[PDB]
Write a protein that binds this ligand. Structure first.
Ligand code: ZN
Ligand code: ZN
Lengths: 21, 30, 30, 21, 30, 21, 30, 21, 30, 21, 30, 21
């Protein structure tokens, strides 16, 4: 998941938007 | 914007900044 | 534990602390 | 909501547990 | 993305997030 | 300045990009 | 509440949240 | 100590209460 | 170094920074 | 106390050193 | 003051505290 | 640089002053 990917690898702010309400 | 290495509370901080008033869901694996 | 005023990112930091692996939902509009 | 209870007013760690999944 | 009130250290945290490796300048006086 | 725009008023992540080197 | 892995300033943040107005002592080994 | 244990291993919020005044 | 308004968790973060390994005591009531 | 000096008013890093153990 | 191990946003926090109103430049290598 | 040294090794607050405006 994003939680894992952002920490194990790397992630972008655009990817984080998918988790907004 | 650039790619970021976010772990722990640092991620929820990023989420708060990106989503703001819209709110968000924090769903880690466990 | 004591009561406290928690606003903005400080509120989500506390949720992260309390909920941990369970995860949480931050919904201002609710 | 959470904001009205924890920011406007004060709230306990126990109350925050209501928002865990 | 949404608009937000960012003050003090919270403002520099956001700059760090947005700018990342590029780096930034924080100049209150400007 | 940045402070007047992001703290006094509100600002977007895009606006913050103006301060990246 | 769940178990937490807290290092550095992240611990003092947890302490501040748990103790609040009661105050606390931060005593690391060195 | 708690400082070490919380970081080397893991610790609970209940354990952290022992350090409050 | 400059003077600054430090409140809540920000105050304990600064103490952690300044004191480091020495440790500190945060006592609001005093 | 520390709060009255650093939050109500302003204080320096040197003043904070008075609270180190 | 003591020596500190500062990484990520923890460094920009230290910079904000040390420089305050003077402002600062965050210039990492990349 | 300071960014690297503070994280790879260790750095002091006095060293960080060199980066203020
Ligand atoms: Zn951290
Ligand atoms: Zn704050």
């Amino acid at each position: 998941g994003i939680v894992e990917q952002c920490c194990a690898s790397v992630c972008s702010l655009y990817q984080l938007e998918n988790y907004c309400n | 914007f650039v790619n970021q290495h976010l772990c722990g509370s640092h991620l929820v901080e990023a989420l708060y900044l990106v989503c703001g008033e819209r709110g968000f869901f924090y769903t880690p694996k466990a």
